[PDB]
Amino acid sequence: SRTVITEVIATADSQGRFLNSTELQAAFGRFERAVPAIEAARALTKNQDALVKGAVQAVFKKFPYVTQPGEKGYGDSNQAKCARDIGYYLRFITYSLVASGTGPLDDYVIAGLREVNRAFNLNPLWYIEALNYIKGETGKLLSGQSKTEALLYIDHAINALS
Amino acid sequence: SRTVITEVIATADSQGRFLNSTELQAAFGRFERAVPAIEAARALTKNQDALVKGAVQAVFKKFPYVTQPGEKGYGDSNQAKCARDIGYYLRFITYSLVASGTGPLDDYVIAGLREVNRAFNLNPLWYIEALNYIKGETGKLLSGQSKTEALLYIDHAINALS
Amino acid sequence: MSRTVITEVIATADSQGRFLNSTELQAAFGRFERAVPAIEAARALTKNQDALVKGAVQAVFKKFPYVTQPGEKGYGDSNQAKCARDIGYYLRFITYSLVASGTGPLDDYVIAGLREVNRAFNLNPLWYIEALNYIKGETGKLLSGQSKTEALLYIDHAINALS
Amino acid sequence: SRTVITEVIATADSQGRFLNSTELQAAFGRFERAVPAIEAARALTKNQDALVKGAVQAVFKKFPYVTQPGEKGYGDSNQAKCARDIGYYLRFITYSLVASGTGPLDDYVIAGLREVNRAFNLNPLWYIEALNYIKGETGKLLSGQSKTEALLYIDHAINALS
Amino acid sequence: SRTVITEVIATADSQGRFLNSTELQAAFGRFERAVPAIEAARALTKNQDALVKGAVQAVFKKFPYVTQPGEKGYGDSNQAKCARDIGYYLRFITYSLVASGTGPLDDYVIAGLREVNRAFNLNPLWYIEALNYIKGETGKLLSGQSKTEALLYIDHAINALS
Amino acid sequence: MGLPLLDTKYSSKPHRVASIPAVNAEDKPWVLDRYDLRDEQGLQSFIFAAYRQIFSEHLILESNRQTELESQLRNGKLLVKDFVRGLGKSEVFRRLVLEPNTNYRFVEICLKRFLGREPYNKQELIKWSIIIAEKGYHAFIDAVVDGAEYAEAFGEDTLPYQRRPLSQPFNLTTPRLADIFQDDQRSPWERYAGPKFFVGWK
Amino acid sequence: MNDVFTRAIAQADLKGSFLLESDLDKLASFAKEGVKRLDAVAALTNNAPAIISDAAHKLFAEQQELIQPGGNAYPHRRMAACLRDMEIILRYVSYALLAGDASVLDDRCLNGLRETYNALGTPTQSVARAVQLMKDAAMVHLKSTANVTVGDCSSLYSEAATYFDKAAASIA
Amino acid sequence: MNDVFTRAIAQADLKGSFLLESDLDKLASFAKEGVKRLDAVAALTNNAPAIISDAAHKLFAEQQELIQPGGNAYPHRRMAACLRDMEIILRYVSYALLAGDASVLDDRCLNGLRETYNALGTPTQSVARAVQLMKDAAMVHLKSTANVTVGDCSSLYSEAATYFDKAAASIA
Amino acid sequence: MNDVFTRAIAQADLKGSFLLESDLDKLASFAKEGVKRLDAVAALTNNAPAIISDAAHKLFAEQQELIQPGGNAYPHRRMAACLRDMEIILRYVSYALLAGDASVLDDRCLNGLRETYNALGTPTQSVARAVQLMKDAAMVHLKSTANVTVGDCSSLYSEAATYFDKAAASIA
Amino acid sequence: AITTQGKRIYKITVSEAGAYATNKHRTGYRAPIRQSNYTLTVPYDRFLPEMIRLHQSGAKIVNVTSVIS
Numbered sequence A, B, D, E: 001s002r003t004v005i006t007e008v009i010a011t012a013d014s015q016g017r018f019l020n021s022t023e024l025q026a027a028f029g030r031f032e033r034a035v036p037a038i039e040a041a042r043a044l045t046k047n048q049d050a051l052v053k054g055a056v057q058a059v060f061k062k063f064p065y066v067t068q069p070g071e072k073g074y075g076d077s078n079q080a081k082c083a084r085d086i087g088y089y090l091r092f093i094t095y096s097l098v099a100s101g102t103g104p105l106d107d108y109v110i111a112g113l114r115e116v117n118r119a120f121n122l123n124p125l126w127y128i129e130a131l132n133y134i135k136g137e138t139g140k141l142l143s144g145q146s147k148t149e150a151l152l153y154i155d156h157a158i159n160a161l162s
Numbered sequence C: 001m002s003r004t005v006i007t008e009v010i011a012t013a014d015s016q017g018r019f020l021n022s023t024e025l026q027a028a029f030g031r032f033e034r035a036v037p038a039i040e041a042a043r044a045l046t047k048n049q050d051a052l053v054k055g056a057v058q059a060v061f062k063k064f065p066y067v068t069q070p071g072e073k074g075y076g077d078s079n080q081a082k083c084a085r086d087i088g089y090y091l092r093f094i095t096y097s098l099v100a101s102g103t104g105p106l107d108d109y110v111i112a113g114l115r116e117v118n119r120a121f122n123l124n125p126l127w128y129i130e131a132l133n134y135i136k137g138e139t140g141k142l143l144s145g146q147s148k149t150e151a152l153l154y155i156d157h158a159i160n161a162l163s
Numbered sequence F: 001m002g003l004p005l006l007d008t009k010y011s012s013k014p015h016r017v018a019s020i021p022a023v024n025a026e027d028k029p030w031v032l033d034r035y036d037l038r039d040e041q042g043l044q045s046f047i048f049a050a051y052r053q054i055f056s057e058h059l060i061l062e063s064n065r066q067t068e069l070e071s072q073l074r075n076g077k078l079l080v081k082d083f084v085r086g087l088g089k090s091e092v093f094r095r096l097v098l099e100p101n102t103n104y105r106f107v108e109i110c111l112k113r114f115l116g117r118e119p120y121n122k123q124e125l126i127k128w129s130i131i132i133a134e135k136g137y138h139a140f141i142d143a144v145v146d147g148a149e150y151a152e153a154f155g156e157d158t159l160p161y162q163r164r165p166l167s168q169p170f171n172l173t174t175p176r177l178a179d180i181f182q183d184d185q186r187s188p189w190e191r192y193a194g195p196k197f198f199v200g201w202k
Numbered sequence G, H, I: 001m002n003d004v005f006t007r008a009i010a011q012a013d014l015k016g017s018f019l020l021e022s023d024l025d026k027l028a029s030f031a032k033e034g035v036k037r038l039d040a041v042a043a044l045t046n047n048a049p050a051i052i053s054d055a056a057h058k059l060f061a062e063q064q065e066l067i068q069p070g071g072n073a074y075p076h077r078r079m080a081a082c083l084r085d086m087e088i089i090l091r092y093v094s095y096a097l098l099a100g101d102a103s104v105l106d107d108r109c110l111n112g113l114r115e116t117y118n119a120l121g122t123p124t125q126s127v128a129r130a131v132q133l134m135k136d137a138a139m140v141h142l143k144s145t146a147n148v149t150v151g152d153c154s155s156l157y158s159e160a161a162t163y164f165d166k167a168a169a170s171i172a
Numbered sequence J: 001a002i003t004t005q006g007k008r009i010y011k012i013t014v015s016e017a018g019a020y021a022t023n024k025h026r027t028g029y030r031a032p033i034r035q036s037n038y039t040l041t042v043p044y045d046r047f048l049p050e051m052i053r054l055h056q057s058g059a060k061i062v063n064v065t066s067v068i069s
């Protein structure tokens, strides 16, 4: 996929030269931020069960009408799809945290997002405010460098959706 | 020139995208390395004349023939041009340290090195010897990370010449 | 720079660097026949534009009750005016496309740049989908025969591209 | 390799069009030139040994410093490699004389000469002046059109080295 | 125009290099070949009037119907244009002889010939007949290399016409 | 992608009407093709011609040389179109040609070097430059080399050449930079203010 | 495309001299405040759609003549182009804010934009107004004390305002 | 192209679950060894011309028929091709070493080299000998403790050994 | 592009008439002296590196201001471009000397050279000085008699001198 | 090409059988005619457009292989 060191190797291969000072500096700048991001990934992993619920009920609070019958959100299987989607999103946020780059998130969510949302009549605002709830609760579940990492990845996913 | 920040900006601009998290982590890695690198640049600037003259005499010792009349190194003008060239190399190495990227070297010295050296019948080995002297004196003059950075840039110059 | 029958003919002739062969004249003559029901539909649609626009706004409200309550896009007198204006735009360009006997007006004025603008202003395409479906239902009554089909083609094209 | 007839045939086939006047008549001129050229190649191949030994001490004469210990010229196998290289150059000069084109010498020496010389630190000026010695010796060995042909091929090789 | 020397220069410039040995050899061949070609062109220049008149007569002989009224060749002006066209063809053949390349021929008559003849309903067979008859006479007027040059350029015009 | 581009709004140019052979054959640019790639010296000449066409013969330095593209071209795993696109999407091309220029002069240079013809008019620079502004010169280069006009004029196996009598070469008239102040240079009126390092009979 | 480091290097090279100790001190200070600089550029990047939507809402409430038939942003294509231009300018301002030097913005965005708009029939005063509205919307987000360590970012705010001002002035 | 962390991501996403405690701990343990790994890759880089020079010298000292007329690397073009192959092999080995994953090297450099060599008629076993010589010089230049802090590097040496060995096996 | 023969042909064609016998005699004389012309062109070709090296040495002795920092031949790149321009001009001069007609210079090299140099900010008087220095260095190699039969070639000397002066005037 | 997409390049074998020859003869030959079969390598990102281009050209593909995985 795409990471910081992945971009290092990619640009070195494009310019066709041995790894130099700039991109080795980038590699260790990645490695220093590796362990706060790992702590962020662990903390976000521990609490996955509370977040998936909190997110789907936050979605329902934001859009009361989707729950009402004759709509799309109606249906237990649709509820399970809600939970599965949020699980995928936070899973790939954890992956991006681990890899120190938005590559896994890019590849597994953002690639082809718009037309998938278009064809299945999925409203991106649903996931934007779901990630908004997740961002709000990571505002308290983490602090410091790990919190900044999680916040940046969540906001980048939100911008991709919007 | 080309630094970490300029690589980041150019890579973002060639895909027409905003600066994402990977680029900012690379930038932070640069900003944290700047302190040792600027310390190395300050030390190397303090030691102008000693380093330059030592490198010139090292070149003269390793190539005793060049100082003989009828050769390149004979005459006050040619020795002055030797001192000037080694000063150029040292100046651009300090520029690279400050920039935290091999842009100053690659753009000022390296780009066009073979063509000019071949046209004027300059030997890359003279400069390789001088830079090896500078590398040796750097270990005395610098301690810790600053020495590592300076050695990295001098090594890049030596690899470019050879 | 619209993409109509005559323009497609001339563009494909010029691209090939040749005069207009007989097939191109054949297509042009088909367009010239076709214009009469198209102009009839454009007339019977521009004549009744006001009823169509009002009915479309009301139909959107009926299908989307939630847009009306406070804190939503539909609440507001100015937003009502912009409802009517947007639907009038769509209807006007449908009539233009009928006159031009192509989708050129829709593609050039509405369809190109639709999704970015809707995303930027958070306008739901389903609102206009419902309004255009209402207009389709009515132009079923207003028109009949070849003109009815000809109007339905362009209304359908607008709906398909809104999707 | 590449020669006049090769150029003619390759050009005509590239255009997929028969040999026009100019191709025929260039081939004609080559066929007249074939007579002095083969005699020149004979005269060169008669005297290979004397030429190679003369050239090698020409090298050691204008560059005394190579034979000092720790330099490239010092050593018996090193000088044997020198003799082999000068033999290669003379053989390729003869090849080009026979073929009436520098194509042999181009494809077998010039192709990737510079990077190979830089890899093994073989200073070209050695070979320029060895070919200068061969030029001077064929200045008396040959006479007439054979002489001017040998001189022009040695000039091509020298220009390539420089 | 296309010429031996001009092709030399164009080929050298395309590869961004100086005029190498083979290319100068082609130029030398052209300079040697100039004398027969210039003598042949001078001989054609003296006999221009008899040649053009006879060529018009041969055209009328092999194509009797065009002389009849209601056809292309009937009319005093059309016969004046017979003479003018054949004078053009012969003049451009002499231009090619002097230039030692078909450059003038393709420059003036050959390029655009087909659609000009098609637009003005000029049957190329008339000119093929006239050029064949000029070929027959230039067999008599010239002997040796000069005859070969003339027949070469005339047969080039013949192939182009057919 | 995104929005559609504007209208091309053509202009009368020699390339638009080239049914007739050009005036001088020697002034016709050399149409270099795949059969040149099979030989070794021919391959070197092709590579030099590509660098002259895109980089303009003054950027042909051992430091600007794309080794990997040359190796791929040597294998035959790479189309000539892909070699040209890779030269366009290279750090040297950006750093030397894109950076000094605006989007518009860069578009003009790219038209002259990849398509072989000068722009129809300024509105063509305007309509092309938005691809740069919105997607990067990478997407601009792909748009040019995958475009209809490039596919028609040259194709996948031909190396671009100027569609002009070549008695008026493009590289001579268009430098990589024109009428800009360079941060590494000095104004012509200014004088050096630094160490003299020597006294040669001043 | 120069950052502050490369600008200092280029001036030092033109003088033919090493970098003075004061210049090294200024660059060390820049590197020290680079963390706050990264926070600011992240704030601009992660709120780009919101900034553009706010600026657009204000601009087309204020200037209704654009969105009318015969206005410059009337059909969907021109409205989309308006929003796209705003996003481009915001992108280049964020680049400049990261680099600390407006060379990137002038070179790659603003160098020939006024004449492009004149050739397209675009009211450059309206574009400058749009850039100012983007400035306001971006300053609302840059000053967000929540979610970041609290500190003095007045210098960063002034730099961002200067880049937005310089964009607006160069356009109109 | 992947790194070891992308490898673990790939397996975890294949299984659907998240990163386990053991996986996350192993990744962190590798990450703190990143500054460990940069020194090794820098040693490979800064001495690459020296490594390749000595490797070529030894390879042509032990095999003589290669430079012999009729040999594979006899003309200057083919000798330059040999040196460039050693260049690219070492560069991609260093790339893989920094990555910690074999994916990049095996996918990009080693994917179609053996078939190309078979087509060209180049002896692949000689390439294997050259890459072992390159491995020898690489260990020589890695083990140097000068200019860097003393420490335990057996894991990096072992991984580089595996990397050179698998490259040799793939070419062979 | 026209050589001398094609130039005479073009003149005659403008007059719409056959070539005069005097014109044929002139072209015959040119063809006869073509071998001396070929030696002149070969003298320029073979000694080209010496010509460019000497011209550069003299030019950078005269104008130190070009090689000082900020000069227009200062960094290695600009010096290499200088040397490349010098070889380009010498190469086109050899082309014109071969053809006998300076159409090559005007068409390909000097059509808009001054405008280009002004665009690049190059000192044009220094380019003219470089061309004059190449002329001075090249006359020495042309006048050399070693390994060529002695003869009278002052006409070729004047021709080469006027090609160099034409290039220098067109640039300057 | 950094992502997983730019990896997994695919080799394509193309045959220029009579359907392609008819199209090239009616439209014309802008380049000299080449041999029938050739193996042409493409990354994943240009895979779909390239089969679109080949199918439009009328050439019938013989073989496709995955160079990577």
Ligand SMILES: CCC1=C(C)/C(=C/C2=NC(=C\c3[nH]c(/C=C4\NC(=O)[C@H](C)[C@H]4CC)c(C)c3CCC(=O)O)/C(CCC(=O)O)=C2C)NC1=O
Residues within 6 Å of the ligand: B059, B066, B072, B073, B074, B078, B079, B081, B082, B083, B085, B088, B089, B108, B109, B116, B120, B122, B126, B127, B130, I057, I060, I061, I067, I073, I074, I075, I076, I079
């Ligand atoms: C971008 C930075 C830069 C560099 C590095 C540079 C090197 C450089 N040195 C030069 C001269 C020279 N430099 C030397 C140096 C030699 N003197 C002793 O012999 C030593 C053994 C040896 C130095 C280690 C000599 C002898 C010359 C004169 C060359 C000649 O005139 O033939 C020249 C030719 C211009 C001139 O005539 O002054 C260049 C381009 N130029 C640049 O713009």
Ligand SMILES: CCC1=C(C)/C(=C/C2=NC(=C\c3[nH]c(/C=C4\NC(=O)[C@H](C)[C@H]4CC)c(C)c3CCC(=O)O)/C(CCC(=O)O)=C2C)NC1=O
Residues within 6 Å of the ligand: C057, C060, C064, C067, C073, C074, C075, C079, C080, C082, C083, C084, C086, C087, C089, C090, C109, C110, C117, C121, C123, C127, C128, C131, G057, G060, G061, G067, G073, G074, G075, G076, G079
């Ligand atoms: C070429 C044709 C064209 C179209 C179609 C178009 C759509 C359009 N409608 C707009 C306003 C609007 N339009 C609506 C429409 C909604 N109101 C709700 O009651 C309904 C469910 C629904 C309509 C039935 C709304 C809510 C707004 C205000 C959006 C906002 O200001 O955030 C705007 C923003 C311009 C402004 O108000 O300053 C655009 C671009 N523009 C065009 O130039």
Ligand SMILES: CCC1=C(C)/C(=C/C2=NC(=C\c3[nH]c(/C=C4\NC(=O)[C@H](C)[C@H]4CC)c(C)c3CCC(=O)O)/C(CCC(=O)O)=C2C)NC1=O
Residues within 6 Å of the ligand: E056, E059, E066, E072, E073, E074, E078, E079, E081, E082, E083, E085, E086, E088, E089, E108, E109, E116, E120, E121, E122, E126, E127, E130
């Ligand atoms: C580059 C040199 C050149 C050539 C060679 C040339 C051929 C030429 N001959 C022409 C006239 C003509 N040419 C002919 C054909 C000749 N008369 C017939 O009786 C004979 C069978 C035949 C002599 C072999 C005729 C009948 C005309 C006048 C009417 C017409 O063009 O249809 C014309 C049309 C111009 C006009 O009179 O309006 C052309 C282009 N033009 C050129 O600029």
Ligand SMILES: CCC1=C(C)/C(=C/C2=NC(=C\c3[nH]c(/C=C4\NC(=O)[C@H](C)[C@H]4CC)c(C)c3CCC(=O)O)/C(CCC(=O)O)=C2C)NC1=O
Residues within 6 Å of the ligand: F003, F004, F005, F006, F103, F104, F126, F127, F129, F130, F133, G066, G072, G073, G077, G078, G079, G081, G082, G083, G085, G086, G088, G089, G108, G109, G110, G113, G116, G120, G122, G123, G126, G127, G130
């Ligand atoms: C990287 C630097 C750069 C930029 C930013 C740039 C902008 C740019 N804006 C354009 C058109 C446009 N620009 C605008 C924007 C204006 N209209 C509204 O009234 C607003 C007041 C205002 C936006 C805030 C519009 C509406 C068009 C469309 C004009 C048309 O479609 O005819 C175009 C050409 C037409 C196109 O293909 O869309 C460009 C290239 N070009 C560059 O090289």
Ligand SMILES: CCC1=C(C)/C(=C/C2=NC(=C\c3[nH]c(/C=C4\NC(=O)[C@H](C)[C@H]4CC)c(C)c3CCC(=O)O)/C(CCC(=O)O)=C2C)NC1=O
Residues within 6 Å of the ligand: A145, A148, A152, B021, B024, B025, B028, G032, G035, G036, G038, G039, G040, G042, G142, G143, G144, G145, G148, G149, G150, G151, G152, G153, G156
């Ligand atoms: C991956 C990208 C990245 C981010 C997101 C990042 C944020 C970041 N902000 C920090 C502190 C800070 N952050 C800010 C910025 C805030 N000050 C005001 O509240 C403003 C509203 C706002 C900026 C406009 C300041 C002033 C500091 C203190 C800097 C210092 O201690 O020197 C720190 C250091 C932790 C500390 O000093 O305790 C980090 C890592 N760093 C990064 O490499």
Ligand SMILES: CCC1=C(C)/C(=C/C2=NC(=C\c3[nH]c(/C=C4\NC(=O)[C@H](C)[C@H]4CC)c(C)c3CCC(=O)O)/C(CCC(=O)O)=C2C)NC1=O
Residues within 6 Å of the ligand: D059, D066, D072, D073, D078, D079, D080, D081, D082, D083, D085, D088, D089, D108, D109, D116, D120, D122, D126, D127, D130, H056, H057, H060, H061, H067, H073, H074, H075, H076, H079
């Ligand atoms: C195609 C024809 C061809 C040529 C021309 C050629 C030149 C050539 N000579 C070589 C060996 C060598 N040749 C020399 C010769 C130099 N040292 C002294 O003897 C002389 C002063 C001077 C010669 C004028 C030296 C020193 C080496 C060994 C380099 C080293 O081991 O470091 C090598 C490298 C082989 C190796 O290092 O194992 C090459 C490529 N090779 C070819 O295949």
Ligand SMILES: CCC1=C(C)/C(=C/C2=NC(=C\c3[nH]c(/C=C4\NC(=O)[C@H](C)[C@H]4CC)c(C)c3CCC(=O)O)/C(CCC(=O)O)=C2C)NC1=O
Residues within 6 Å of the ligand: F067, F068, F070, F071, F072, F074, F075, H066, H072, H073, H078, H079, H081, H082, H083, H085, H086, H088, H089, H108, H109, H110, H113, H116, H120, H122, H123, H126, H127, H130
């Ligand atoms: C994926 C990145 C990449 C790789 C891996 C690569 C290797 C590579 N080496 C090649 C040629 C070659 N390589 C060699 C080297 C052999 N000769 C023996 O003496 C040595 C033991 C051995 C070297 C270790 C030779 C002789 C050739 C040329 C074969 C020929 O011309 O027939 C070629 C054919 C292309 C050309 O040279 O024009 C490639 C692709 N190139 C690349 O872009």
Ligand SMILES: CCC1=C(C)/C(=C/C2=NC(=C\c3[nH]c(/C=C4\NC(=O)[C@H](C)[C@H]4CC)c(C)c3CCC(=O)O)/C(CCC(=O)O)=C2C)NC1=O
Residues within 6 Å of the ligand: A021, A024, A025, A028, A029, B144, B145, B148, B152, H035, H036, H038, H039, H040, H042, H043, H142, H143, H144, H145, H146, H148, H149, H150, H151, H152, H153
């Ligand atoms: C700009 C590129 C860059 C480099 C070059 C770099 C090297 C680097 N090596 C370090 C310590 C170290 N370096 C090594 C590696 C060495 N130990 C043995 O001598 C081996 C010969 C050799 C391995 C090749 C070790 C074992 C440590 C100490 C481990 C630790 O502190 O945990 C440190 C931290 C402490 C210090 O040295 O000041 C750095 C930053 N980091 C970077 O970001």
Ligand SMILES: CCC1=C(C)/C(=C/C2=NC(=C\c3[nH]c(/C=C4\NC(=O)[C@H](C)[C@H]4CC)c(C)c3CCC(=O)O)/C(CCC(=O)O)=C2C)NC1=O
Residues within 6 Å of the ligand: F055, F056, F057, F058, F059, F169, F171, F172, F173, F174, F175, F176, F177, I066, I072, I073, I078, I079, I081, I082, I083, I085, I086, I088, I089, I108, I109, I110, I113, I116, I120, I122, I123, I126, I127, I130
């Ligand atoms: C058709 C033949 C032809 C000529 C003649 C020609 C001149 C020429 N020289 C150029 C670069 C240059 N030319 C020079 C020449 C100067 N250096 C010193 O000042 C001297 C006074 C002087 C040379 C004696 C320099 C310094 C540059 C580099 C300027 C730059 O890259 O910005 C460029 C710009 C090309 C580029 O930047 O990519 C052109 C067009 N170009 C051609 O295609």
Ligand SMILES: CCC1=C(C)/C(=C/C2=NC(=C\c3[nH]c(/C=C4\NC(=O)[C@H](C)[C@H]4CC)c(C)c3CCC(=O)O)/C(CCC(=O)O)=C2C)NC1=O
Residues within 6 Å of the ligand: D152, E021, E024, E025, E028, I032, I033, I035, I036, I038, I039, I040, I042, I043, I142, I143, I144, I145, I148, I149, I150, I151, I152, I153, I156
């Ligand atoms: C490979 C391409 C090629 C070349 C280069 C070539 C040169 C060449 N030079 C010749 C003689 C000559 N060469 C010269 C020219 C020299 N006289 C000196 O004073 C001047 C310094 C110098 C002029 C620059 C002269 C005057 C002659 C005597 C023939 C004559 O005067 O016409 C001859 C006639 C044979 C002879 O009697 O020696 C040839 C063929 N031939 C070729 O096929």
